[PDB]
Amino acid sequence: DEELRQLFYLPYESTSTLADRLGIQLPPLELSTAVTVLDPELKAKLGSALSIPEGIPFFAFNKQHSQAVKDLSKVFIEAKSLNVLKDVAIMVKDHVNSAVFLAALYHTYYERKDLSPGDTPPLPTVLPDRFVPTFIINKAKKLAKSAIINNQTEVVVEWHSDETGLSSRSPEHRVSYWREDMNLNSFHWHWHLSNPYYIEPGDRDRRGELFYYMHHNLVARYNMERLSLNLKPVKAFEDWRIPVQDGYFPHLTTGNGQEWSSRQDSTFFQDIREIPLVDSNYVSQLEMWRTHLYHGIDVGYLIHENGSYVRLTDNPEVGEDYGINLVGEALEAGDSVNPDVYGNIHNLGHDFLGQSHDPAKKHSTTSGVMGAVETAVRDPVFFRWHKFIDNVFHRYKLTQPPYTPRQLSGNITVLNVTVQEEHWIDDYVSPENLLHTFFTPKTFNSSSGIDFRLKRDDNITVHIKSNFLEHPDFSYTITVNNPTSDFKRMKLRIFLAPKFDEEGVKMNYASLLRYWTEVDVFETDPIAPGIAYITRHSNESSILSTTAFAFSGCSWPRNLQVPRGTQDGMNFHFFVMATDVSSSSFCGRPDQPIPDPWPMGYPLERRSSKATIEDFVDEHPNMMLQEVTITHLRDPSSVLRRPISERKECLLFTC
Amino acid sequence: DEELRQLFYLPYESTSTLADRLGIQLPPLELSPTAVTVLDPELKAKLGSALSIPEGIPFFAFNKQHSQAVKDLSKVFIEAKSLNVLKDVAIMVKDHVNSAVFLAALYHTYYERKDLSPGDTPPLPTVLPDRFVPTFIINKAKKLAKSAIINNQTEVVVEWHSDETGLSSRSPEHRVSYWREDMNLNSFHWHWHLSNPYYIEPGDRDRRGELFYYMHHNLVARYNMERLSLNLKPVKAFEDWRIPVQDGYFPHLTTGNGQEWSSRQDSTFFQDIREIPLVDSNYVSQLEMWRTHLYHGIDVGYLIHENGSYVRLTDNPEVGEDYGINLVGEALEAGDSVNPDVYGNIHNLGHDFLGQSHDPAKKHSTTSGVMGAVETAVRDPVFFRWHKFIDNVFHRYKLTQPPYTPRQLSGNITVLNVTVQEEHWIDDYVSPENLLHTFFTPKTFNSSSGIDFRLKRDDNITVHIKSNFLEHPDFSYTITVNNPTSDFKRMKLRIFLAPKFDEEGVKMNYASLLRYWTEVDVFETDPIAPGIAYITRHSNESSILSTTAFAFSGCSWPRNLQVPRGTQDGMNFHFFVMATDVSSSFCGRPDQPIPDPWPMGYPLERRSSKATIEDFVDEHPNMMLQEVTITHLRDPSSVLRRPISERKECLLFTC
Numbered sequence A: 001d002e003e004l005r006q007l008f009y010l011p012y013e014s015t016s017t018l019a020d021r022l023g024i025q026l027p028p029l030e031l032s033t034a035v036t037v038l039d040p041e042l043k044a045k046l047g048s049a050l051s052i053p054e055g056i057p058f059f060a061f062n063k064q065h066s067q068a069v070k071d072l073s074k075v076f077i078e079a080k081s082l083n084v085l086k087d088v089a090i091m092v093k094d095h096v097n098s099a100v101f102l103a104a105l106y107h108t109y110y111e112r113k114d115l116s117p118g119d120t121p122p123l124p125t126v127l128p129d130r131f132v133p134t135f136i137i138n139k140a141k142k143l144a145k146s147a148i149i150n151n152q153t154e155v156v157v158e159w160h161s162d163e164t165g166l167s168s169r170s171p172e173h174r175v176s177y178w179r180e181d182m183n184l185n186s187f188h189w190h191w192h193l194s195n196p197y198y199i200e201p202g203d204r205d206r207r208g209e210l211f212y213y214m215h216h217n218l219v220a221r222y223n224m225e226r227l228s229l230n231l232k233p234v235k236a237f238e239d240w241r242i243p244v245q246d247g248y249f250p251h252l253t254t255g256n257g258q259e260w261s262s263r264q265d266s267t268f269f270q271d272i273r274e275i276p277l278v279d280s281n282y283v284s285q286l287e288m289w290r291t292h293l294y295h296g297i298d299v300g301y302l303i304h305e306n307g308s309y310v311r312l313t314d315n316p317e318v319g320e321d322y323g324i325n326l327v328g329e330a331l332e333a334g335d336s337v338n339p340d341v342y343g344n345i346h347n348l349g350h351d352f353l354g355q356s357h358d359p360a361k362k363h364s365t366t367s368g369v370m371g372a373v374e375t376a377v378r379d380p381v382f383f384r385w386h387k388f389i390d391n392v393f394h395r396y397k398l399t400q401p402p403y404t405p406r407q408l409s410g411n412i413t414v415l416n417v418t419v420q421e422e423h424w425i426d427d428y429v430s431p432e433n434l435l436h437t438f439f440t441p442k443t444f445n446s447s448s449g450i451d452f453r454l455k456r457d458d459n460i461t462v463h464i465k466s467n468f469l470e471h472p473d474f475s476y477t478i479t480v481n482n483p484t485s486d487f488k489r490m491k492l493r494i495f496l497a498p499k500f501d502e503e504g505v506k507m508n509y510a511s512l513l514r515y516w517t518e519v520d521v522f523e524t525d526p527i528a529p530g531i532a533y534i535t536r537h538s539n540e541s542s543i544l545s546t547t548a549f550a551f552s553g554c555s556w557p558r559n560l561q562v563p564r565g566t567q568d569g570m571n572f573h574f575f576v577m578a579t580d581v582s583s584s585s586f587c588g589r590p591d592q593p594i595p596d597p598w599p600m601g602y603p604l605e606r607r608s609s610k611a612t613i614e615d616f617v618d619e620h621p622n623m624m625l626q627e628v629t630i631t632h633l634r635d636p637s638s639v640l641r642r643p644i645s646e647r648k649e650c651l652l653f654t655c
Numbered sequence B: 001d002e003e004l005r006q007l008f009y010l011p012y013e014s015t016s017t018l019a020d021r022l023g024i025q026l027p028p029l030e031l032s033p034t035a036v037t038v039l040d041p042e043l044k045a046k047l048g049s050a051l052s053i054p055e056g057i058p059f060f061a062f063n064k065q066h067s068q069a070v071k072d073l074s075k076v077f078i079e080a081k082s083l084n085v086l087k088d089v090a091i092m093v094k095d096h097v098n099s100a101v102f103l104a105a106l107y108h109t110y111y112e113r114k115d116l117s118p119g120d121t122p123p124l125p126t127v128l129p130d131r132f133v134p135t136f137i138i139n140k141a142k143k144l145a146k147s148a149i150i151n152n153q154t155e156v157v158v159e160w161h162s163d164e165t166g167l168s169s170r171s172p173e174h175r176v177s178y179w180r181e182d183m184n185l186n187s188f189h190w191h192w193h194l195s196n197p198y199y200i201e202p203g204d205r206d207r208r209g210e211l212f213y214y215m216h217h218n219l220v221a222r223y224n225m226e227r228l229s230l231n232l233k234p235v236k237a238f239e240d241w242r243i244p245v246q247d248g249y250f251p252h253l254t255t256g257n258g259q260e261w262s263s264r265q266d267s268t269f270f271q272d273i274r275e276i277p278l279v280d281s282n283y284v285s286q287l288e289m290w291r292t293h294l295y296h297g298i299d300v301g302y303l304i305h306e307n308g309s310y311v312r313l314t315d316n317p318e319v320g321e322d323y324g325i326n327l328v329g330e331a332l333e334a335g336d337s338v339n340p341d342v343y344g345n346i347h348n349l350g351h352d353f354l355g356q357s358h359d360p361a362k363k364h365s366t367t368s369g370v371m372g373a374v375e376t377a378v379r380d381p382v383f384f385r386w387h388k389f390i391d392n393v394f395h396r397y398k399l400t401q402p403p404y405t406p407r408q409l410s411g412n413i414t415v416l417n418v419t420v421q422e423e424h425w426i427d428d429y430v431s432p433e434n435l436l437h438t439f440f441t442p443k444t445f446n447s448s449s450g451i452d453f454r455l456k457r458d459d460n461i462t463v464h465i466k467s468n469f470l471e472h473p474d475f476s477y478t479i480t481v482n483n484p485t486s487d488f489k490r491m492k493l494r495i496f497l498a499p500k501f502d503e504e505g506v507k508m509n510y511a512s513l514l515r516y517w518t519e520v521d522v523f524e525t526d527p528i529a530p531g532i533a534y535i536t537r538h539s540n541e542s543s544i545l546s547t548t549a550f551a552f553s554g555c556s557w558p559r560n561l562q563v564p565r566g567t568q569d570g571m572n573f574h575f576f577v578m579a580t581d582v583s584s585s586f587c588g589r590p591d592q593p594i595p596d597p598w599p600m601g602y603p604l605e606r607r608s609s610k611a612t613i614e615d616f617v618d619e620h621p622n623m624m625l626q627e628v629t630i631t632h633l634r635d636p637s638s639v640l641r642r643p644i645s646e647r648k649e650c651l652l653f654t655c
């Protein structure tokens, strides 16, 4: 139902206001203004859903907030039909926190089999306040008021990065376009609502490992963006007695008029003394959880709360859990084997950072953006926290034995690899193995999210325009040989990493492990004996799902599919492996197991005796190491032939 | 001109919006690159730097560029040939000037023009309610307004409590937030600085540097009395600028342009302000060297003029010589300093260092904190730490002065008796002699003169804002004196208040009390006939007051804060009375000299060989030391007779 989709709209307005605008029939009303009557029978089913007060965000990492979303979605998910779901939504909407309501709805599309996440509205069209700076939203309300007066039905407002921080004095602001990318922040929301740590254990396959894998890829790609910008790779925030050097001022205000808290430079990670105090958590508490978890990783087993020991291995027996998954569930934490011993490090860390401006709650303040999944990626400290988290996972990966020859062997030989950018501008054909990136404006209709009307009959639409990194489509072709006498199935596994570090030194195999990111991992049609060519288009990538919002549901943003690269051209490894055998691979499918038994990111998450990626690949005929150049264009038209006039004369052959 | 007063209204709206609402005839209009007044080139050429301050930021009173802009705009207003022309100029420039700069210039104009009276200016909270009322409350008002209009309701009242801006149970400084955030006190601060701006043409005020000292000394002293009433320790100067400011402050204020005031976390360093542009920066060690230079001048008894000559510092001046306290004040503020290059601009810049300490290198595109503006700075607990430092500099200077000689303290009139009596305020209770009370009472004002709450033009909506204030009953005092001479004698009575005991319960000696004395009433009497006379003064006549939520207009110590809070059990205060031989006193009069040649606060700002105030007063028949008790009532009706039936028995005589 596009009737269902309407429930996402105008989340800060009453159900009556939404219903009036949309011609939705309402259940009985009463005065709390006009508010729906909440049937006692429905209320009895709602668990803790109503316990979260209106006027604050959904704090996804907080136990009480997550339980409320889980409790509300439970009713939505268990509704006997979509018509009944629609009725329950309409009835409860006036009585639940709006962000909790929205989170529960999105989660419901992932959990219900008769709903598709691709049919949910793009998050920025629903909660534009989460992605657009305070001053721009305020400027839009102004422009709307004037437009209505002068009988203008449309207005467009826009902004630029030059307006939320000063790059010339703040190196971290150089990558704010990427951290603040509305599609990336929405992807983060989708990931956590598709794979919430509070999910009933068993209803996901390898969710702890997927937590590791998606965030590993998120951190790796961030670093590629940093290298593209002449920044040093992100440093883990691991010594928690050192103040967080780089603060962050989000410049965001919620639809309830609540401006998000900021964090000054040089703020300490401090004990959170909650209200009530008995709900508090402490830095040395998190440190001891970390100590316990490091011990378990180092000795190769966790202790179950039931007293038994659980082996950690990424070479499991049939029916045994993967060690990476067990560590992930313990670290997030989700379905931990022992909450009392290993704790809740990653989630609470978000809340410590998000409350660090007022950790003893003396000043009656809001949380910072680290406290919410749809905003946390904006903050540079997100990536310092996740580099720490990825370090824990890599610590575990290093305890695993290298893949054996048999574990890496394959029947298919990889013979060649070529990458070709598609046509994107007249009179230019990209040389082979060269990819480009550039900035392009995108515009969306914010009136689905914010009611800009002064009075009922006003006809006003506010469009919001801003710049996004983007790239032309590209394809690649893998040439393989099947030397056997029968048809062979294979999975192609393709990963990207920069060739050089920030010092210009070639990264060895060990260092590259921290960088490999998924380009495309998929099964081919059966390969006939002999030579075959397999061609994939960038829009088909395993990391994508299926107008400012190209891909819907849970998807790595298509516009951030290619790292920025540099004006001179930046060199990347393009690793290809042929191995014997519609949702984003980063997101998984709620109702299906991970098909592939190999660990996520295989084979490039384990140590090797080989010193270089070159030496590693040379050992295996089913692996090939290709190379591409990625070039950022400040002015895309620069690729065009310039006249003989205006042509530049070079001092040293090239200029 | 009540048409003049209208210019203060709806400061965030266009001139067209104001004129339309008020039926003001407009000059020619045009469309800016909406309807805006045409600004005559002839007027523009007269405006100096007034137009250089962009719309959308506050007036930053301590900043030299902002103050110059207010001075430049007010100049045109003040020099206008008539009030009709003044109104014309105001109407014409309103669309083209920063609104806070506009308002400041207008208030200053009432002080500076002889045909205008500051008492006729609107109360500041009715003009800029956003400066005094929390963000959440203004936003709640907008919501209540929208609903009211829809339901044909022409009036709405919103209110709030201190429990909503900080948590007293975890933040001792919040216990005195009611006083620091008192809207009348903050308005008084605005008035003081616009009546006595440091940028005034030198000579157009008498002893302005000394008045800067004196008003702030009284402001700090009264704050300390409020702290003692609340079982808080007296305020500590912020003097070692290497130490982070322990107590932060989150103002919870948002301007009418939607710009939320910056906050300051606990434990924030006082840091170099690297301005944009960088050449406009100032540095902590720079301020420290100005301080070193000033301490030196104070200690050796002279300042060095920028012309190379030395200027003696003395509070015993020759006729025609400046007062040392005045010279120090002008150097410290700074205002008409003898040597800007040597003594600097310590006090003003310190406000800006503190106000920008959340982002001192301007990396994060942020706004200033409340310390940057005169109408908000008093809210911040650090205001009083900064002013305790400032008062310490002034006291350092006062201590270099020789004690008053017998001749300087002698008088013809003898003080025989002193009595204080609270007026009637509740039926069936008469206050015992020498007992004063305080309690909290609500006050309400109409905010619709400041904020346009209309959705569309024809809406009839008024938003009242209600909140609690400290208050006290009227009181009077009577001084019994004797004139033992043979002719009529005129005298000035000088009455000061200070607590008797410090925070440790120890009797404060003479030296300690110097830091506490605050003006109660200083005034000249009618000539006193030979023999005995009784002089009775009502509290509403006090010299510290000027002449409905806003009792006294123009520049006045708040009547509601005239009496320190006191305690539930009753707190004891010295009430010092001196008879000396011959429009708030804190504000002075713009056009007239200080009539009294004695230093402000005489004789209780100099050292004495006498150890106690008792010993000091006993030496002089024209001085008497009285004592009063001040008792705060949580519930004012508690003073009433209770039913014999309901009285509870005490274990230890009293309970």
Ligand SMILES: *[C@@H]1O[C@H](CO)[C@@H](O[C@@H]2O[C@H](CO)[C@@H](O)[C@H](O)[C@H]2NC(C)=O)[C@H](O)[C@H]1NC(C)=O
Pocket (backbone or CB within 6 Å): A009, A021, A022, A154, A445, A446, A447, A448, A449, A461
């Ligand atoms: C911008 O977005 C909103 C989507 O909510 C559109 O508003 C709808 O417009 C249709 C056609 O006028 C109305 O029938 C609906 O009642 C509107 N929905 C709501 C909730 O207001 C709007 O049309 C879009 N504007 C443009 C230019 O496409």
Ligand SMILES: *[C@@H]1O[C@H](CO)[C@@H](O[C@@H]2O[C@H](CO)[C@@H](O)[C@H](O)[C@H]2NC(C)=O)[C@H](O)[C@H]1NC(C)=O
Pocket (backbone or CB within 6 Å): B009, B010, B021, B022, B446, B447, B448, B449, B450, B462
């Ligand atoms: C609240 O304050 C405003 C003063 O600004 C009053 O609004 C005026 O009301 C009169 C009478 O209706 C109008 O003619 C004026 O045009 C209004 N002025 C403005 C600027 O709107 C309002 O009346 C006050 N409300 C009460 C109850 O006193």
Ligand SMILES: *[C@@H]1O[C@H](CO)[C@@H](O)[C@H](O)[C@H]1NC(C)=O
Pocket (backbone or CB within 6 Å): A153, A154, A459, A460
């Ligand atoms: C409002 O404006 C839109 C776009 O400007 C126009 O297409 C439409 O006819 C109007 N809608 C209504 C209901 O008046």
Ligand SMILES: *[C@@H]1O[C@H](CO)[C@@H](O)[C@H](O)[C@H]1NC(C)=O
Pocket (backbone or CB within 6 Å): A304, A306, A307, A308
């Ligand atoms: C603890 O739980 C695990 C579940 O896998 C089980 O295998 C083990 O037997 C349990 N320990 C005991 C002694 O119950």
Ligand SMILES: *[C@@H]1O[C@H](CO)[C@@H](O)[C@H](O)[C@H]1NC(C)=O
Pocket (backbone or CB within 6 Å): A409, A410, A411, A580
């Ligand atoms: C190749 O295919 C055979 C037959 O399916 C399979 O059993 C074996 O695992 C593969 N061998 C190699 C060389 O990896």
Ligand SMILES: *[C@@H]1O[C@H](CO)[C@@H](O)[C@H](O)[C@H]1NC(C)=O
Pocket (backbone or CB within 6 Å): A415, A416, A417, A418
């Ligand atoms: C791979 O393909 C590229 C271009 O299509 C070509 O330069 C190269 O010769 C090929 N290598 C092999 C082994 O076919």
Ligand SMILES: *[C@@H]1O[C@H](CO)[C@@H](O)[C@H](O)[C@H]1NC(C)=O
Pocket (backbone or CB within 6 Å): A473, A539, A550, A551, A558
């Ligand atoms: C790839 O996706 C983008 C956005 O959806 C689209 O512009 C482009 O045409 C797509 N390419 C193809 C051939 O589908």
Ligand SMILES: *[C@@H]1O[C@H](CO)[C@@H](O)[C@H](O)[C@H]1NC(C)=O
Pocket (backbone or CB within 6 Å): B154, B155, B460, B461
């Ligand atoms: C607005 O409402 C008030 C009462 O709240 C009323 O006195 C006044 O007449 C109204 N204004 C108009 C123009 O009707």
Ligand SMILES: *[C@@H]1O[C@H](CO)[C@@H](O)[C@H](O)[C@H]1NC(C)=O
Pocket (backbone or CB within 6 Å): B305, B307, B308, B309
């Ligand atoms: C410097 O200024 C003072 C101010 O009174 C004046 O008396 C003195 O003559 C000046 N010094 C010189 C040398 O000009």
Ligand SMILES: *[C@@H]1O[C@H](CO)[C@@H](O)[C@H](O)[C@H]1NC(C)=O
Pocket (backbone or CB within 6 Å): B410, B411, B412, B581
């Ligand atoms: C007392 O009055 C006389 C006459 O005016 C005056 O000279 C003297 O200064 C006054 N004060 C004292 C203490 O003598």
Ligand SMILES: *[C@@H]1O[C@H](CO)[C@@H](O)[C@H](O)[C@H]1NC(C)=O
Pocket (backbone or CB within 6 Å): B416, B417, B418, B419
């Ligand atoms: C002062 O006045 C009070 C009350 O009016 C009286 O009781 C006391 O005796 C007086 N003292 C003198 C010295 O007159």
Ligand SMILES: *[C@@H]1O[C@H](CO)[C@@H](O)[C@H](O)[C@H]1NC(C)=O
Pocket (backbone or CB within 6 Å): B474, B540, B551, B552, B559
């Ligand atoms: C003193 O001022 C207050 C506030 O304006 C007023 O309520 C009281 O009546 C005044 N007292 C007298 C007697 O003027």
Ligand code: CUO
Pocket (backbone or CB within 6 Å): A188, A192, A215, A346, A350, A373, A376, A386
């Ligand atoms: O989890 Cu995805 O934000 Cu730390």
Ligand code: CUO
Pocket (backbone or CB within 6 Å): B189, B193, B216, B347, B351, B374, B377, B387
């Ligand atoms: O000066 Cu009155 O605010 Cu420091």
Ligand SMILES: [Cl-]
Pocket (backbone or CB within 6 Å): A075, A078, A079, A080, A084, A088
């Ligand atoms: Cl149901």
Ligand SMILES: [Cl-]
Pocket (backbone or CB within 6 Å): A159, A160, A161, A466, A467, A468
């Ligand atoms: Cl942008």
